């Protein structure tokens, strides 16, 4: 079945409709530019279906968000971070066997080799946790060349997946070390993902690090909840490089520096600055309400708007909740920010200029918050952002390579200066 | 003068879409309403229909072999212009005034000098390490260090500060990856050279042996890097701009393009020219063997393009200087001018290659002129880096004054509908 | 006794070579200064093979030992430079691709990179003069081992 | 043949001795992953 195009001229075109399991409908441009010698024009591509996915179903309308078809809000209560890696990842879940095996090859290869740890030694303390994490990230693909190498078997795929999802979290960790200036913990094989890598960050010897299980949960679920998110920049960067072949070390490094971006995963970091700048000027609420309704007053409200999301984010509204909780579980009674955060949105939500542009907190509102809780500072939220958003990048990845996607080449419409003569100096 | 497009979509729904006609007659439609007035997307699968962005940089058209910068073409920059200047050009949008080109070149200059701690980081690098991984690990060590180039809202002033740091540094620690694999000092960046003749110094100059700056080593390598300094929208420059449109840094959006290009696929990027070339003397320097039998890859060894069809118009202006380069050392009758005539000559003869458009492409050229330096295998890629710089930053640069959204396309999610978790127990 | 060719091949070959690998420089930092400079000769000295692994492979050709040869007399010259730098605490000099062996020797050991060393060739004649003296003795402990 | 106190005493000064001095670990981090073990053994034998 088809879509039928008529261009200028008597020329017409019969483009095919394709509709995936959710009812989203394209029609397939495959052909266009080899039949006609049109292309789209697309900024953003705010119209474009860059692939065909079954890892994530989006429906940024009415605000759905399901991993394989598992609702989030199920995941994000009773799922861990590993098993909601590897239904990403591979596809299902896991059975008890799968889920032992894949946490059990995790656990092996979380140690760094020593070269990697005398390249970190070189960082100095005041570097940025995500200059650290991109550049140690990419480093990889120099200690394991075999993951360039043409004809990646599965299995050595598989050792690629599971060595890099080990080394983020070790290597995340020292990028907090670095800014402390604290000795770097080894992995411990006794310690699940998530407690190893609160272990990592926060253990140091002249204090007894007691695992806190509130923690440890609380990470789980913000992690699950980073887990993917479809066709994002950060993703879409890691399929481009990656269709070129790249090591998957190379495509994720490139994922890390989408991510970084203020317009991507750099706004939880900035959200977190709003927060605490609403609580130094002790002003109200409604005043920087109506500086967010003032076209150019110089504040912006951070952590609301999405590109998909024309509704709650239901990763948002699983933080706000968790927030609460977390926060009690831990005696942190009235964080100021908090309150600041849900005043926010209780006016933005109710106030019908917010609700006309579509305006709801997105997954980078609440973040900061629970993070800020778990002892995590604000130089390391876009790194936890990216040790969430890793197993997605991973299975994003995995699906373009089996799909044997061809290399991703944009086109342009040339819009500069038509054939024009060198011109020499002394002539200018 | 303004056309439209008809879409008729099944159901009864149509859509008039706006034609845009660029400057050399390509035609796009604006499907910037698409979605929001039809429930579709396009499906595109490697972004082959797609126009990203309008660019005032590079013009090509593949079937008629052309390529110009800013509408001058190709061949008189070449033969007339230099590295800096073709820099200048792309990234600024003119040829340079003497005061444009001389501060230009001179702020470069001051510039080449790497922070020692960058050397820190260095040093931890194994001297075995490929050096397109310590390429891409230290430019993106570079926004730790200029943490000013994340920031949102940065001067122009600032943006050309980003913009000459990079074009300098990238050229330093290209070869300081050279020095690593050999196990010499690094060189110092000199004062009183221009661009190439610098880079040239700080790559072969070492203690125990006078360099000499040959000036037709010089204009050849001038020549090369021009040649390469961009090429339109592919893979890696789309890279830079993805990653750019999320107000990554240009260090960050550059480092992600470095990990494209290293990807097999890319095109050009195919260190298989100089392993041709050394796999063949080592085999007694016969030409007709490795021919025969690679019959019983091509375009990993500088053999036929993917947009040029018949030639490439890079090609026939490389041949010269590569002829130069040759007779200016001492190989008129050495084994690389054979082994390169003989394959060159099966290409430009042999029905097989002919068939094919198996042509010898600017790279077959590059590589011998690498090889005649005695460039290894392993810094085929950098060189490539090195050349592409100035066309990544112009692109970037673009990308950014035209205020282009982030980059975030859509899917059509053909997976799994809603299932309910099951918890491990239950499974199996 | 070798042709004007044959020596200046040798004698050039011998000048590349004197560069030692930074990798060694780095072993070389972890030695204090107080160290014997005999433990760093000979520590140094068998450091070598792991670095040229191409030496103790099986099937030497002729061409391999020749290179073998010039790497070993050209490094010992640095190294042992070293070994005094290492004593006095002064910065390493590279060797230089202008001066002959024995000045090469006597610039690396006794310049500083604050000055022009003045070369006196009535040193660096009594040096050549005194290393042909113990070039070789015929089966000592030393040669024999 | 050592008595049990002979061979107590040569097995304890031998363990208390198995500390490598802080300096011959920092000699040994000049040493690439790639160089074979021989050429360790044997070079920091000689620094001893």
């Given at each position: 079945?088809?879509?039928?195009?008529n261009?200028?001229?008597?020329?017409?075109?019969?483009l095919?409709?394709?509709?995936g399991t959710?009812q989203?409908?394209?029609?397939?441009?495959?052909?266009?530019?080899?039949?006609t010698?049109?292309?789209?024009?697309?900024?953003?591509?705010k119209?474009?279906?860059?692939?065909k996915?079954?890892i994530?179903?989006?429906?940024?309308?009415?605000?759905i968000?399901?991993?394989?078809?598992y609702?989030i809000?199920?995941l994000?209560?009773?799922?861990?971070f590993?098993?909601?890696?590897?239904?990403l990842?591979?596809?299902?879940?896991?059975?008890?066997?799968?889920?032992?095996?894949?946490?059990?090859?995790?656990?092996k290869?979380?140690l760094?080799?020593?070269?990697?740890r005398?390249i970190?030694?070189?960082?100095?303390?005041?570097?940025?946790?995500?200059?650290?994490?991109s550049s140690?990230?990419?480093?990889?693909?120099?200690?394991?060349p075999?993951s360039?190498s043409?004809?990646?078997t599965?299995?050595?795929?598989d050792?690629?997946?599971?060595?890099?999802?080990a080394?983020?979290?070790?290597?995340?960790?020292?990028?907090?070390?670095?800014?402390?200036?604290?000795?770097?913990?080894y992995?411990?094989?006794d310690?699940d993902?998530?407690?190893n890598?609160l272990?990592?960050?926060?253990?140091?010897?002249?204090?007894?690090?007691?695992?806190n299980?509130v923690?440890v949960?609380?990470?789980?679920?913000?992690?699950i909840?980073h887990?993917?998110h479809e066709?994002?920049?950060?993703?879409?960067?890691?399929?481009?490089?990656?269709?070129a072949?790249?090591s998957?070390y190379?495509?994720?490094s490139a994922?890390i520096?989408?991510?970084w971006?203020?317009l991507?995963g750099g706004?939880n970091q900035?959200?977190?600055?709003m927060?605490?700048?609403?609580?130094?000027?002790?002003?109200?609420?409604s005043?920087?309400?109506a500086?967010?309704?003032?076209?150019?007053?110089?504040?912006?409200?951070?952590?609301?708007?999405?590109?998909?999301?024309?509704?709650?984010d239901?990763?948002?509204?699983?933080?706000?909740?968790?927030?609460?909780?977390?926060?009690?579980?831990?005696?942190?009674?009235?964080?100021?920010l908090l309150?600041?955060?849900?005043?926010?949105?209780?006016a933005?939500?109710?106030d019908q200029?917010?609700?006309?542009?579509?305006?709801?907190?997105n997954?980078?509102?609440?973040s900061?918050?629970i993070?800020?809780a778990?002892?995590?500072?604000t130089?390391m939220?876009?790194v936890?952002?990216?040790l969430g958003?890793?197993?997605?990048?991973?299975?994003?990845?995995?699906?373009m390579?089996?799909?044997?996607e061809?290399?991703?080449?944009?086109r342009?419409?040339?819009?500069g200066?038509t054939?024009?003569?060198?011109?020499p100096?002394?002539?200018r």
């Open positions: 079945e088809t879509a039928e195009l261009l200028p001229g008597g020329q017409s075109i019969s095919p409709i394709f509709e959710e989203e409908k394209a029609f397939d441009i495959g052909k266009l530019r080899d039949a010698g049109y292309v789209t024009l697309d900024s953003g591509y119209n474009t279906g860059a692939c996915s079954a994530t179903f989006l429906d940024g309308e009415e605000g968000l399901r991993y394989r078809g609702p809000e199920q994000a209560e009773n799922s861990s590993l098993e909601v890696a590897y239904l990842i591979y596809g299902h879940l896991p059975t008890e066997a799968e889920l032992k095996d894949f946490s059990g090859h995790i656990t290869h979380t760094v080799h020593e070269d990697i005398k970190f030694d070189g960082f100095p303390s005041s570097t940025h946790p995500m200059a650290i994490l140690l990230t990419c480093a990889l693909t120099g200690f394991y075999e360039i043409p004809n990646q599965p299995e050595a795929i050792l690629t997946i599971v060595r890099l999802m080394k983020m979290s070790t290597i995340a960790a020292w990028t907090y070390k670095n800014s402390v200036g604290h000795p770097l913990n992995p411990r094989n310690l993902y998530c407690a890598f272990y990592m960050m926060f253990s140091f010897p002249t204090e007894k690090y007691e695992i299980p923690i949960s609380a990470l789980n679920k913000l992690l909840l887990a993917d066709q994002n920049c950060s993703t879409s960067t890691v399929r481009l490089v990656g269709s072949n790249a998957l190379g495509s994720v994922g520096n989408a991510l971006g203020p991507h706004a900035e959200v977190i600055e927060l605490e700048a609403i609580e130094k000027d002790g002003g109200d609420t005043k920087f309400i500086q967010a309704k003032d076209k150019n007053s110089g504040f912006r409200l951070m952590g609301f708007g999405h590109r998909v999301y024309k509704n709650f239901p990763r948002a509204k699983i933080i706000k909740v968790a927030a609460d909780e977390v926060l009690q579980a831990l005696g942190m009674q009235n964080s100021p309150k600041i955060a849900t005043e926010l949105e209780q933005a939500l109710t200029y917010f609700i006309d542009r579509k305006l709801y907190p997954v980078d509102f609440y900061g918050i993070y800020k778990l002892g995590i500072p130089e939220f876009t936890m952002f990216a958003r890793l197993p997605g990048w991973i299975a994003q990845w995995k699906e390579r089996e799909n044997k061809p290399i991703g080449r944009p342009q419409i040339y819009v200066e054939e024009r003569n060198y011109v100096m002394t002539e």
